Design an enzyme around this catalytic site. Structure first.
Site, PDB file in Angstrom:
ATOM      1  N   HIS A  18       0.807  -1.192   0.000  1.00  0.00           N
ATOM      2  CA  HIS A  18       0.000   0.000   0.000  1.00  0.00           C
ATOM      3  C   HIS A  18       0.839   1.240   0.000  1.00  0.00           C
ATOM      4  O   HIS A  18       0.290   2.323  -0.175  1.00  0.00           O
ATOM      5  CB  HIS A  18      -1.009  -0.030   1.107  1.00  0.00           C
ATOM      6  CG  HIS A  18      -0.441   0.260   2.425  1.00  0.00           C
ATOM      7  ND1 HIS A  18      -0.104  -0.729   3.320  1.00  0.00           N
ATOM      8  CD2 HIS A  18      -0.182   1.434   3.023  1.00  0.00           C
ATOM      9  CE1 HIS A  18       0.333  -0.171   4.428  1.00  0.00           C
ATOM     10  NE2 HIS A  18       0.311   1.143   4.269  1.00  0.00           N
ATOM     11  N   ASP A  60       0.282  -7.488   1.558  1.00  0.00           N
ATOM     12  CA  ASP A  60       0.686  -6.101   1.601  1.00  0.00           C
ATOM     13  C   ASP A  60       2.188  -6.058   1.703  1.00  0.00           C
ATOM     14  O   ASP A  60       2.764  -5.792   2.741  1.00  0.00           O
ATOM     15  CB  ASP A  60       0.038  -5.402   2.765  1.00  0.00           C
ATOM     16  CG  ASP A  60       0.244  -3.955   2.724  1.00  0.00           C
ATOM     17  OD1 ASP A  60       0.666  -3.447   1.682  1.00  0.00           O
ATOM     18  OD2 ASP A  60      -0.028  -3.309   3.727  1.00  0.00           O
ATOM     19  N   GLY A  75       2.384   6.450   8.631  1.00  0.00           N
ATOM     20  CA  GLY A  75       3.716   6.832   8.298  1.00  0.00           C
ATOM     21  C   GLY A  75       4.692   5.772   8.632  1.00  0.00           C
ATOM     22  O   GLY A  75       5.813   5.813   8.168  1.00  0.00           O
ATOM     23  N   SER A  92       3.891   2.618   7.897  1.00  0.00           N
ATOM     24  CA  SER A  92       3.617   1.558   6.962  1.00  0.00           C
ATOM     25  C   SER A  92       4.818   1.238   6.152  1.00  0.00           C
ATOM     26  O   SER A  92       5.530   2.125   5.710  1.00  0.00           O
ATOM     27  CB  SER A  92       2.588   2.005   5.969  1.00  0.00           C
ATOM     28  OG  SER A  92       1.360   1.708   6.532  1.00  0.00           O
ATOM     29  N   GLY A  93       4.972  -0.017   5.879  1.00  0.00           N
ATOM     30  CA  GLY A  93       6.019  -0.465   5.064  1.00  0.00           C
ATOM     31  C   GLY A  93       7.253  -0.742   5.832  1.00  0.00           C
ATOM     32  O   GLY A  93       8.122  -1.414   5.336  1.00  0.00           O
TER      33      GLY A  93
END
Ligand SMILES: [Ca+2]
Lengths: 5, 223
Positions: free
Chosen positions: B40, B84, B175, B177-178
């Site tokens: 995402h 994801d 923020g 994420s990933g």
């Protein structure tokens, strides 16, 4: 809810 | 990261910031040319910023390297957030050093209760928004699948795990994420989603990287 900005 | 602590500059040397003129996601450097992040987080114009601590100040040790490939998992479902995961190939290999270092992929999945380090530059408030300058860290355990599924019924796929706290106050947040969930030196998770941040009974949900190691390796090997 995804945690990107 | 809500309820975390300042990691300390470059203490999470595999943490990258994905930047598109602003930090928008984290990622994890898994070799000198490849970053794992969340699907995402995909967008055009990704600049991977390695070696960051204060993402708003050039402090030294940064390497900004454009993404040359951003490979969202083909089965990423942006509604369920299943799969994801995204791989970003850096346009050039990062110079690996003590401050820019890859993190190992898991050789096996992590068990419930595994303590992990989650880090990022995401929001540090569970209500409202405060985006930190420096990288924040949170030690967080992987929750049991049962607790995870209890918290997020019907939403947790086999490619997700929950980590964090049910009592609230400690979570990854927007923020983050990933970014990485590293447990015993292995990237076991990618910050993916959750119901709010640091809300009671709503732990963070993370992509279960161990389910993707082969995909990662195969994708890297073919790109
Ligand atoms: Ca910086």
């Amino acid at each position: 809810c995804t945690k990107s900005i | 990261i809500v309820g975390g602590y300042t990691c300390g500059a470059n203490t999470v040397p595999y943490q990258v910031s994905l930047n598109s003129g602003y930090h928008f996601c984290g990622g994890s450097l898994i070799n000198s040319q490849w970053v794992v992040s969340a699907a995402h987080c995909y967008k055009s114009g990704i600049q991977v910023r390695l070696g960051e601590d204060n993402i708003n100040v050039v402090e030294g040790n940064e390497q900004f390297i454009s993404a040359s490939k951003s490979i969202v998992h083909p089965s990423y479902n942006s509604n369920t957030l299943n799969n994801d995961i995204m791989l970003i190939k850096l346009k050039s290999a990062a110079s690996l050093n003590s401050r820019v270092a890859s993190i190992s992929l898991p050789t096996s999945c992590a068990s419930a209760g595994t303590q992990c380090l989650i880090s990022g530059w995401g929001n540090t408030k569970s209500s409202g928004t405060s985006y930190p300058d420096v990288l924040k860290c949170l030690k967080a355990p992987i929750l049991s699948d049962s607790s995870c599924k209890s918290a997020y019924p019907g939403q947790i796929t086999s490619n997700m795990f929950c980590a964090g706290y049910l009592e609230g106050g400690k979570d990854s947040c927007q923020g983050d994420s990933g970014g990485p969930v590293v447990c015993s030196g292995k990237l076991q998770g990618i910050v993916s989603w959750g119901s709010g941040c640091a809300q009671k009974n709503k732990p963070g949900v993370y992509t279960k990287v161990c389910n993707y190691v082969s995909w990662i390796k195969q994708t890297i090997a073919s790109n």
